[PDB]
Write a protein that holds these residues in place. Structure first.
Motif: not given
Ligand SMILES: *[C@@H]1O[C@H](CO)[C@@H](O[C@@H]2O[C@H](CO)[C@@H](O)[C@H](O)[C@H]2NC(C)=O)[C@H](O)[C@H]1NC(C)=O
Ligand SMILES: [Ca+2]
Length: 476
Positions: A183-192, A215-220
């Motif tokens: 999930v983490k890999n997918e969201w992060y790749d998604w948002v950028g 979860f959030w720092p990698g997302y930010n």
């Protein structure tokens, strides 16, 4: 698009489906009770950006962009954008990927930012949780990607709140297991990519308290822009720490005493005053939070009282407080809807008048804030200092010495008596001429340094040294 870039910004928050139709109708029905798409579009926004920029906003925040569950659920359509199920597709109700990219562009041509609302906690589905067909979720096609089904029953239990599902068995919200690296890999790749494809200047992040913190720092990072989170709790002990994990959060701690202080002629100035210092001390940076008193998840301010003087005072507080002001489309036309869905009124039905009482007010407040920021590189970082209160009054100070804005706010309402506040602590020099920038009068500081502030009609007062306004158009 950086967090420093965002401190100077002033956000106009709108629902894409409810702000402006492509055809520009101001009469097209939109019955909030129906809970259906009313037809607002990205292109509609572009055609009214004169009306948003004319209040002196520099930025807009739109509801999520991803393609939604298609059904008309027992709770209506997903007009609001929070029930996504295909994240690499757009909700076609609002327009093309061309239309979206073109919104990000009509904005940039205007020196304005684009903020986009994003959900990572959950998908949406029509029906009970035990009947979810995960194969519909692109790209989270299996139940492996999701938490086990359960409802959140005790918000005191932070470990439920993150792992059980929001919603009910009528519209269920399947809760992505944000713990597992798939999930983490997918969201992060998604948002950028989302940010890149559409040139998004910053993100508003939904339901942050429902995803675990790490979860959030990698997302930010992955997003590569300023992120402000919706942590829906009034307690600074709970909500401020989420700033340890992302740039900002919406200032819900201020929200409650702010509303109560102005929603009637006997609201507690004490509570507001104290929460301002509480957030100043305890949140990591009060100047990266978002200030608001209306949104789509609470009864509008005017649903508590139609007194325009009180409405003026709160709108002023929002613009002049620490952080980023966030006005909710409709608030500037004195909309009075109650809780969801009654607070999702279509903006076009107001006819968009640029001379309504709250639009002139919000314009004057944004104007002085944008101008002060022009002349004072310390304004966005100087923390709002509450210099005075009484039973019906709060007065606050923000800006470098010599250039500070000093704001006197009242809850006497629109029938308030006329008197004279002797205001200490404003910090100006004896005899210095001050411009009250809402009503465009002048006040002179006087011999002991206290400011004789004329108080009438329950009206806000916003003071700025007159000599510093030499250039501007502010009261000319
Ligand atoms: C931004 O646009 C690009 C294409 O313009 C998207 O790239 C696709 O991403 C998926 C990942 O699930 C790949 O399997 C596809 O092969 C990619 N297509 C192309 C043409 O490269 C990208 O995902 C878009 N980002 C968002 C958030 O929509
Ligand atoms: Ca969750």
């Amino acid at each position: 698009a950086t967090p420093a870039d965002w401190r100077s910004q002033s956000i106009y928050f709108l629902l894409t489906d409810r702000f402006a139709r492509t055809d520009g109708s101001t009469t097209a029905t939109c019955n909030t009770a129906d809970q259906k798409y009313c037809g607002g579009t990205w292109q509609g926004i572009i055609d009214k950006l004169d009306y948003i920029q004319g209040m002196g906003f520099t930025a807009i925040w739109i509801t999520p962009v991803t393609a939604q569950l298609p059904q008309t659920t027992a709770y209506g359509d997903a007009y609001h954008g929070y029930w996504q199920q295909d994240i690499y597709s757009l909700n076609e109700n609002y327009g093309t990927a061309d239309d979206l990219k073109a919104l990000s562009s009509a904005l940039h041509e205007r020196g304005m930012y684009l903020m986009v609302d994003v959900v990572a906690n959950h998908m949406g589905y029509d029906g009970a949780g035990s009947s979810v067909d995960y194969s519909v979720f692109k790209p989270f096609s299996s139940q492996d990607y999701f938490h086990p089904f359960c409802f959140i029953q005790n918000y005191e239990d932070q470990t439920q709140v993150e792992d059980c599902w929001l919603g009910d068995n009528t519209v269920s919200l399947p809760d992505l297991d944000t713990t597992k690296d798939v999930v983490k890999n997918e969201w992060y790749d998604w948002v950028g990519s989302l940010v890149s494809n559409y040139s998004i200047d910053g993100l508003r992040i939904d339901t942050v308290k429902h995803v675990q913190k790490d979860f959030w720092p990698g997302y930010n990072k992955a997003a590569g822009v300023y992120c402000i989170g919706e942590v829906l709790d009034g307690d600074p002990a709970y909500t401020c720490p989420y700033q340890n994990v992302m740039d900002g959060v919406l200032n819900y701690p201020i929200y409650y005493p702010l509303l109560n202080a102005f929603k009637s002629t006997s609201g507690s100035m004490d509570d507001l005053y104290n929460m301002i210092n509480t957030v100043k001390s305890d949140c990591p940076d009060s100047t990266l939070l978002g200030t608001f008193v209306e949104n789509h998840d609470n009864p509008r301010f005017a649903s508590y009282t139609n007194d325009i003087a009180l409405a003026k005072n709160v709108a002023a507080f929002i613009i002049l407080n620490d952080g980023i002001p966030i006005i909710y489309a409709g608030q500037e036309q004195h909309y009075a809807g109650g809780n969801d869905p009654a607070n999702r009124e279509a903006t076009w039905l107001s006819g968009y008048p640029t001379d309504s009482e709250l639009y002139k007010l919000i314009a004057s407040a944004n104007a002085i804030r944008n101008y002060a920021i022009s002349k004072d590189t310390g304004f966005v970082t100087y923390k709002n200092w509450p210099i005075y209160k009484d039973d019906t009054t709060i007065a606050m100070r923000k800006g470098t010495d010599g250039s500070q804005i000093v704001t006197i706010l009242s809850n006497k309402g629109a029938s308030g008596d006329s008197y004279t506040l002797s205001l200490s602590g404003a910090g100006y020099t004896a005899g210095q001429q001050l411009t009250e920038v809402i009503g465009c009068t002048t006040v002179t500081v006087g011999s002991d340094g206290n400011v004789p502030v004329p108080m009438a009609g329950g009206l806000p007062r916003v003071l700025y040294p007159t000599e510093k306004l030499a250039g501007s158009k502010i009261c000319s």
